[PDB]
């Protein structure tokens, strides 16, 4: 038995932090909330693989 965290939302900004080694803050706009999160370069590389843009769930 194990618990896992689930994140989802509409992508608002894909931008480095302010200075960098290339990480990307992904601002996920959900319905009931808006939060920004910082990710690893590998999951950001898969984000570049999925060909997402501004406004994709």
């Amino acid at each position: 038995k194990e618990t896992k965290e689930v994140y989802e939302g509409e992508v608002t900004e894909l931008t480095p932090e302010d200075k960098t080694i290339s990480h990307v803050i992904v601002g996920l706009k959900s319905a009931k909330g808006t939060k920004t999160l910082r990710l690893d370069p590998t999951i950001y590389e898969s984000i570049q693989r999925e060909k997402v843009s501004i406004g994709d769930v």
Binding site: E5, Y7, E17, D18, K19, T20, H23, I25, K35, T36, L37, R38, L39, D40, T42, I43
Partner: protein
Amino acid sequence: MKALVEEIDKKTYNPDIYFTSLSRPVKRINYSLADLEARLYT
């Protein structure tokens, strides 16, 4: 282990400046007049 996902604010968080913090205790305050005037005039 190392979390690949990190929640972060836009205004409060900066990637460069990282800061972490937590009979009667009382901070030490110098009652010297020349120390306070020496601090305020430098």
